[PDB]
Design brief:
Chains A, B: It is found in: Cytoplasm; Nucleus. Chains A, B: It comes from Rattus norvegicus. Chains A, B: This is Major vault protein. It is classed as structural protein. The structure is cut from a larger assembly and holds two copies of chain A (about 200 residues). By secondary structure, chain A is mostly beta strands. Helix content of chain A is about 0%, strand content about 30%. Chain A is built from no helices and 16 strands. In chain A, the strands form seven sheets. A three-stranded antiparallel beta sheet of chain A has the order 2-1-3, with no helix packed on it. A three-stranded antiparallel beta sheet of chain A has the order 11-8-12, with no helix packed on it. Chain A has a two-stranded antiparallel sheet with strand order 4-6. In chain A, a hairpin with a 5-residue loop joins strand 14 and strand 15. Chain A is elongated and about 80 Å long. At the A-B interface, strand 6 of A face loops of B.
């Protein structure tokens, strides 16, 4: 049929065979396709993201500094392809032709008071407060609080802060030329103790 | 049929196929649908909430500062989608197209004299008396009284206040750099005693 039914919060993709490019078809409207148009799939709900949750879709529609969906000169949506987008929490928004949904309403990261998150850049990027991170720079995020899942950063594991009781010490060991608690060149394979009672 | 029967306290949702948006149909009236209109479901009772009870419906209709149901320019009700509403106790009100009933006439929280409620923000929000709460800030609500279920706050568990009799003390233990009864840096894993006879 040439008659489509898009309810208040659903979307579809239409491939206009004459214009040979596609576009997003957001409601609310019981829209009717032209002879050239052809709907690919049925109304599917718009990508929702509740508060304190997140989602991340690859091939994001590259928007200018005003945040508008630049439709390419051909008529197809302008996608970054390789890049991703960090969708925090927002209204049900419709995906455009070409966006592969990778994360979807996944609960946001919840770091406990006595643990942390091992970080690993995936590529080089400028940090929140203006720092150059290298491909493998090991960042560490102790909380408590909630981390915001990034595309230039990856969480490797969860660190459990070892509790050193009174009259105790924690035997450590370095895996690189790093610096520990009190300024001692800590070479690879070297060991040392912790010296303050506290997680 | 094109004839509908809404009793004094019931409602329905109607999807006008020409206007391609929906709206709420609150009584009291035996309303008749147009050729364009089509009723989705039968009269269902309006969302009631008795005194000293509560309910909470997600996707709440975002009202302005005057508390009116802003109908969107399309004609559909304007919903916050991700957010929720804190319905305390009020008359039987009708739901709008798009609101998923999550809490419904659940009895309000009743904190006893000798217990409390472990709190856990779910996200950041401004507190009753102007305080910034972080995603995981641990609040504690001793009563007696009745707490009001929030959307930015979550009750984790019920604390039973341990009664320390005469010539006794309670062995405590910290799980973070917190402060106990008398100002001593209480590091993680440290232990100490209570020193006043009283719940």
């Amino acid at each position: 049929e040439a008659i489509i039914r898009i309810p208040p919060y659903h979307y579809i993709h239409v491939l206009d065979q004459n214009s040979n490019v596609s576009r997003v078809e957001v409601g609310p409207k019981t829209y009717i396709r032209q002879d050239n148009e052809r709907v690919l799939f049925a109304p599917v709900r718009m990508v929702t993201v509740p508060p304190r949750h997140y989602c991340i879709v690859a091939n994001p529609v590259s928007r200018d500094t005003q945040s508008s969906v630049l439709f390419d000169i051909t008529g197809q949506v302008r996608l970054r392809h390789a890049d991703q987008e960090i969708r925090l929490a927002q209204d049900p928004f419709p995906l455009y032709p070409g966006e592969v949904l990778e994360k979807d309403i996944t609960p946001l990261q919840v770091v406990l008071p006595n643990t942390a998150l091992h970080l690993k850049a995936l590529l080089d990027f400028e940090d929140k407060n203006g720092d150059k991170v290298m491909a493998g720079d090991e960042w560490l995020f102790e909380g408590p609080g909630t981390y915001i899942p990034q595309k230039e950063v990856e969480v490797v594991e969860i660190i459990q802060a070892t509790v050193i009781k009174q009259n105790q010490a924690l035997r450590l060991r370095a895996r690189k030329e790093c610096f520990d608690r009190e300024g001692k060149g800590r070479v690879t394979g070297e060991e040392w103790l912790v010296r303050s009672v506290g997680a």
